[PDB]
Amino acid sequence: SEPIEAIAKFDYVGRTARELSFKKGASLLLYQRASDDWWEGRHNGIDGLIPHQYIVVQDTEVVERSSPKSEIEVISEPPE
Amino acid sequence: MGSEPIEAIAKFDYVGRTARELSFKKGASLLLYQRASDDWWEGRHNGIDGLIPHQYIVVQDVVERSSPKSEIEVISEPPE
């Protein structure tokens, strides 16, 4: 399952160093849903966090990436 | 003694690999609620609840918290 394409529907200015900043209409790539409000993604070659409320996500497809990783998933394997 | 959360100290820096995991520096004071598996604990660092890899900490030595919850325990009550 490739990373999920999204487009910014509003401007966003990141508040911390972990967050992406982007303008309405920005092409975004989404690796993984982190929580209800947040995705891990990428904008213009930079990895960072993306607020869900500011984007529209392309769904012609995967649930693995669009749902947060579960505890049982994480703890079933050693850490990297 | 008794049922309190178990204290631990980070012996190595750790950067969380998923959104469920705590990140901490060597020497961090950690609080451990419940062993999740051999390699993982449910705990807390600096007010944030998350997962802590066993191999990165030293634990201060109930068995209740230091052993993973059993199936029979979990299935003995309804979901959830």
Shape of chain A: globular
Quote the beta fraction of chain A.
Answer: 35-45%
Largest sheet of chain A: 5 strands, antiparallel
CATH class of chain A: Mainly Beta
Q: Could you tell me which chain pair has the largest interface and how many residues each side has?
A: A-B, 16 and 15 residues
CATH superfamily of chain A: SH3 Domains
Function (chain A): Postsynaptic RAC1 GTPase activating protein (GAP) that plays a key role in neuronal morphogenesis and migration mainly during development of the cerebral cortex. Regulates excitatory and inhibitory synapse maturation and density in cortical pyramidal neurons.
Protein name (chain A): SLIT-ROBO Rho GTPase-activating protein 2
Subcellular location (chain A): Cell membrane; Cell projection, Dendritic spine; Postsynaptic density; Postsynaptic cell membrane
Modified residues (Phosphoserine) (chain A): 66
